[PDB]
Design a protein around this ligand. Structure first.
Ligand SMILES: Nc1ncnc2c1c(I)cn2[C@@H]1O[C@H](CO)[C@@H](O)[C@H]1O
Ligand SMILES: Nc1ncnc2c1c(I)cn2[C@@H]1O[C@H](CO)[C@@H](O)[C@H]1O
Ligand SMILES: Nc1ncnc2c1c(I)cn2[C@@H]1O[C@H](CO)[C@@H](O)[C@H]1O
Ligand SMILES: Nc1ncnc2c1c(I)cn2[C@@H]1O[C@H](CO)[C@@H](O)[C@H]1O
Ligand code: NA
Ligand code: NA
Lengths: 313, 314
């Protein structure tokens, strides 16, 4: 029922056992190199499926996507509407993370550029109207066209530009916001969005139903247009390792909770749990779902009643 | 016969259509090119020496994925008999993004390279005679040290070529790699860093080596003898530069091939300059092509018809 649009990628994740704060010819001797499934839509679809949601992945990959497809389908993700390029290869994200969880990365779009040829009308015709479509980081034209299709067909959507906010222009960003049921960013991305669009906090809130702003170690804010604000602190980490995909994980947990009928605070607590589980894994989809560990850490952070309510659904 | 020790790698080379100088931590570069190529300093130098017609043996550590690389190098005359193939590790991986101004941001995962420390140059000598020259290139640090020590004890002339690993090695580690070298190869930044980290002066270094070779990017190369005798060779000017990866390896290979062919220092450096610009004008370090006529033409344009004729003769 949730249609996740955005990048599908292979992540090449490396660990630099030093600090980027020190330091043109930058060279980092890394002590770990692993290749994992990635892309924001891949990550969010994977998490929603693992959590038991009904989710369809809508993006563009290369012909190398068969194993990824099996991996996602095994966890309930509908991959029928993944466009497979006959010529391009699946996008490649390459990232080096340092001791302080800082990151230096490159992204090669490849097949992602063909997402602009996807029509959400076909997905609707094939599996009904989605209850929510996530307009995630993607081919910029695909992001715009997907948002426009949502506006035209009456589909509720979540604006989730994250990684692509730096590459989109102010007008391109303004075109992605109006009418969104949700706006997802981190706090840096929130400030950058405001600065690039020229909009004020109020200008933005007048156009959306809810602003969700993640705050890294300080948790997340959920802000309604009338100023009503819920702050949810983190599920504190105990073995953080790589911050790649943490935002995707939070969005997936949160939206799965909402789809299950939980309130904003409870859904955000679930999102916080999934986010820390990703933070404590290298790959974005390398985390494991343990019901008991989930209940325990949720209870430790938010209370037994909150944990019980969350794990019930 | 030249024995090239150093890294064997797969290079993942990307092009950023912007300037790192502007983005100057959560750096993200949208790149418009991504290609995977054969690399490693020893791979590159051995490949270039083989393409130029030299007798060259590659001595390094790769993973079990090395079969196609092995065929690629053997097809160019390279002896790969003494490449150690790790039973468990994978071939090292270099990942690099180059911007519009040829600046680079890169990561290097050693992997199987770490096992080079298990290689005995005594076996290479026993198998193919004493090498004319052993290149101690960027490698597993312990392998670099042990290779230099084995050259010293077996009486093999060697070239200190630490380049990329100079930042990793400590001052004492660097000092242990220099004494007795027939050649010291660095670029100018690496030269200054070597001096600062070892605490040695220019004179301290020159007292221990037979020749200093310092590349200068667009300003060419200096070849400096211990008595101060200096040859400066300007570049073969580029016309389609694209990626600077492997340019130093290419220069070293052309230069040493010229020396092995009996050319003087200036002529050998002119040949090295040619190979270096050909690599600069290719993406991968071994993606360049040897064209005899284009070589003669650009050599002549840069250095004179007689110099070009002398070089291309050998
Ligand atoms: N510019 C982009 N456009 C689309 N997707 C992007 C990027 C970048 I920068 C990284 N990624 C993907 O985001 C995931 C982590 O959130 C990772 O899995 C990674 O693949
Ligand atoms: N649950 C947690 N507990 C403690 N710190 C957290 C988290 C989470 I989710 C994120 N972080 C910090 O925020 C950045 C990545 O989002 C990184 O800087 C990371 O350290
Ligand atoms: N630290 C290192 N140790 C050994 N080899 C290294 C590095 C680094 I940084 C890059 N390379 C290799 O050098 C080649 C270009 O000269 C490229 O082909 C690349 O594979
Ligand atoms: N043959 C040439 N003609 C002009 N410039 C050259 C060369 C060569 I070999 C190197 N360079 C300069 O060095 C940088 C890469 O090392 C390059 O980015 C460039 O600044
Ligand atoms: Na992660
Ligand atoms: Na190159």
């Amino acid at each position: 029922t949730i249609a996740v649009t955005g990048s599908i990628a292979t992540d090449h994740l490396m660990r630099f056992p030093g600090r980027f704060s020190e330091q043109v010819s930058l060279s980092f001797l890394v002590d770990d190199l692993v290749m994992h499934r990635g892309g924001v839509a891949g990550n969010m679809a994977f998490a929603i499926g693992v959590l038991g949601g009904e989710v369809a992945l809508v993006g563009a990959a290369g012909a190398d996507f068969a194993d990824y497809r099996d991996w996602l389908k095994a966890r309930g993700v509908n991959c029928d509407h993944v466009l497979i390029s006959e010529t391009a290869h699946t996008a490649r994200f390459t990232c080096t993370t340092d001791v302080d969880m800082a990151q230096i990365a490159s992204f090669y779009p490849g097949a992602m550029s063909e997402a602009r040829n996807i029509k959400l009308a076909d997905v609707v015709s094939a599996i009904g109207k989605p209850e929510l479509v996530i307009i995630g980081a993607n081919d910029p034209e695909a992001m715009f066209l997907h948002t426009e299709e949502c506006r035209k067909l009456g589909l509720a959507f979540a604006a989730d530009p994250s990684q692509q906010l730096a590459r989109l222009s102010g007008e391109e960003i303004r075109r992605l916001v109006n009418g969104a049921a949700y706006l997802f960013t981190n706090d840096y991305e929130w400030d950058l969005l405001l600065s690039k669009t020229g909009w004020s906090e109020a200008d933005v809130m007048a156009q959306i139903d809810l602003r969700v702003t993640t705050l890294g170690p300080k948790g997340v804010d959920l802000v309604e247009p009338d100023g009503t604000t819920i702050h949810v602190g983190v599920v504190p980490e105990t073995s953080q390792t790589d911050p790649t995909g943490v935002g995707d994980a939070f969005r997936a947990g949160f939206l799965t909770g909402r789809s299950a009928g939980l309130g904003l605070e409870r859904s955000a607590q679930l999102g916080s749990l999934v986010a820390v589980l990703v933070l404590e894994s290298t790959g974005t989809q390398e985390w494991q779902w343990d019901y008991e560990a989930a209940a325990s850490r949720l209870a430790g952070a938010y209370g037994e009643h909150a944990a019980a309510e969350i794990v019930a659904v």
